[PDB]
């Protein structure tokens, strides 16, 4: 009816917001999302401690590739941005050789360590980076680089 | 019934956009918001004149802490972002010692001047910075640093 | 009662539109005409990679086909403090015959800088825009920032 004219504009209005929001989310912010989690590449060079705080400030933590799918998405995300490396949510700060995720959940069978890694170079590497290939590498926590945050859609 | 379905689907859609828009504002853009104002930290080093112009171009002005609540929000904002200092919307450009806000409104009883400030060091300091503590300090206007914009929701 | 609910839904939608407007303009710093949206991507890439990146977001390298579009892009560049960016013009497949990223032919309107295009050393088949807004042909293997254009359709 006559309200449908006003309402009909609203179907278009709501539809328009959906399209533009998609644009902002994808084309502008360049964010990645699965069915349960959202991933965000933050292009600010920080050390591991500051990177984790930044992720927590946004309501998440450093990305935690616990399976093949998550790691692959993160790798593709890295590739398209033309980045060589980012911090991720893996470390062995609390006990050398004993790696855990940022949520303190234990490391498991799945991993993407590059050959020879983790090697704890110079006995000063307790944090983990992901390279464009998707592989993992332990590095010094005082190292400065970009990082990626993970958000649970809960 | 189909009309009830379409309406219910549009309702979920509107709810989804509300949630996604909220995520972008907080997790991605990292903006701070009260009931009347929005605050945006711009991480581009500029001089005071350019900072104000940039804020005006976005439809706002350099932040104006006119009460303790606003100053506290801005201070926490700086802290969480890991910044040491930012330009804010306070100056005494037109008359030495006569400080005004970016909207040309006069300085009042409330202030957060650090001890000894404003001191007009070397008679060359007519702009104002906020440090991580929340305190104010006058500095040279040709100084380059990050800045914070304020937007009126009406 | 139904008209009240409709009006209430209108306020919610208008509010969402307003907040979306704020993010798009005040934060992202995107530029927009009545038909197109422009986005400055600050990642140094070569022309082929820049174009691929633009299509990956659902658009293409900017195509200033009139004075208004070209002026907007220039102001965008000025505001971003950039000296140069890749844009959607080239003569890769045929020398001297420049086309836009949509394969549309070159026309009367242009913003070539004085003396351009010169095809310097026979290795310049792509186009950059400088801060003034002028165009200059350059080598496609050059690496620089670029600007993407999106159709509101
Ligand atoms: Ca160690
Ligand atoms: Ca170690
Ligand atoms: Ca290593
Ligand atoms: Ca003075
Ligand atoms: Ca002074
Ligand atoms: Ca001072
Ligand atoms: Ca050629
Ligand atoms: Ca040529
Ligand atoms: Ca040339
Ligand atoms: Cl370390």
Numbering used by the authors:
A (entry chain A), B (entry chain B): 116 to 269
C (entry chain C): 117 to 269
Article sentences:
Collectin-K1 (CL-K1) is a multifunctional secreted pattern-recognition lectin with key roles in host defence, tissue homeostasis and embryogenesis. It binds to pathogen-associated molecular patterns and activates mannan-binding lectin (MBL)-associated serine proteases (MASPs-1, −2 and −3) to initiate the lectin pathway of complement activation, and stimulate immune and inflammatory processes. CL-K1 is a member of the collectin family of animal lectins with an N-terminal collagen-like domain linked to C-terminal carbohydrate-recognition domains (CRDs) via a helical neck. The structures confirm that the CL-K1 fragment is a homotrimer with the three CRDs linked via an α-helical coiled coil.
The asymmetric unit of each crystal contained two trimers with each CRD bound to three Ca2+. Comparison of the bound and unbound structures reveals no major conformational changes upon carbohydrate recognition. Ca2+ is integral to the structure and function of CL-K1. It not only interacts directly with the carbohydrate ligand but also binds to loops at the top of the CRD. The three Ca2+ interact with residues primarily from loops towards the top of the CRD. As well as explaining the mode of carbohydrate recognition, the structures of CL-K1 also reveal the location of residues that are altered in the 3MC syndrome (Ser169, Gly204 and Ser217). Gly204 and Ser217 are located at the base of loop L1 that forms part of the binding site for two of the three Ca2+. The carbonyl group of Gly204 forms a hydrogen bond with the amide of Ser217, helping to anchor the loop to the side of the domain. Ser169 forms part of one of two helices at the base of the CRD, close to the helical neck of the trimer. Gly204 and Ser217 are located at the base of Ca2+-binding loop L1, so the disease-associated mutations probably interfere with the packing of this loop against the CRD, thereby preventing Ca2+ binding.
